[PDB]
Design a protein around this ligand. Structure first.
Ligand code: A1IZR
Ligand code: A1IZR
Lengths: 122, 127
């Protein structure tokens, strides 16, 4: 299973450790795939190749959202991970895009992410 | 019907009102599961999608991604005077034709929107 993890740039520095925890945990279930035109074409290739797309959606990000819309149009299996303790309110578009099976949105607290990722792929 | 335009920006309030107001001169501006299906219906009906991408937004991102797979004609307007750096995934989605991303200043947005539709009209000019 090629697994695509997408996280924000701001979230890649603020939630840096958390993203690394997600990526290493994902590596137990499959192969983790992860100018501007180059960056774009490459992520798009990875999205099309992915068996599952995993997004951390706590940090509002244009790129992560864009990649989720591209993923939804490719009919990809998607898991979004959102942290309510942050105080943010997840965009109604992302939660509203959930269908509970192919597109799921899980609210979690940072300390249980390994257990939720095991639950998802087990 | 006059053409259908879709405006999307983050959930800067005066700026969005000025953009929607100016867009109404070119056609009908159309703009959790219920919110999602309605926005998707509106993206599919749009002859043109105009997104204000200054503020980071998963929702604005998602709609742009859906608009791209629907092959919608798209204009993204970004304010570099906000302080932010626009995501490489949005600048990178541009191709100069169908998907354009324009850097702008707040006072010229009406003039830029006239420039956008005068160069590629939705409805042609009267003789
Ligand atoms: C190392 C290789 C050459 C490489 C391959 C793919 C990518 C990169 C490097 S990157 O680290 O420069 N960034 C992206 N994607 C990206 C995704 C989102 Cl959601 C963003 O907001 C931004 Cl700015 C970029 N892809
Ligand atoms: C008039 C009716 C009641 C109505 C129709 C469509 C929408 C709404 C109300 S709304 O004001 O609830 N929001 C959206 N879309 C939306 C788009 C983005 Cl990018 C977001 O981040 C969020 Cl949270 C929502 N559509």
């Amino acid at each position: 299973p090629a697994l695509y993890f997408c996280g924000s740039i701001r979230g890649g520095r603020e939630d840096r450790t958390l993203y690394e925890r997600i990526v290493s945990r994902l590596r137990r279930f499959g192969t983790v795939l992860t100018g501007d035109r180059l960056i774009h074409e490459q992520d798009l290739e990875w999205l099309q190749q992915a068996d599952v797309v995993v997004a951390e959606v706590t940090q509002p990000s244009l790129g992560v959202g864009y990649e989720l819309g591209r993923a939804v149009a490719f009919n990809k299996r998607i898991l979004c991970l959102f942290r309510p303790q942050s105080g943010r309110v997840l965009s109604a578009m992302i939660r509203g895009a959930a269908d509970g099976s192919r597109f799921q949105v899980w609210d979690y607290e940072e300390g249980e992410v390994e257990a939720l990722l095991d639950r998802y792929f087990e």
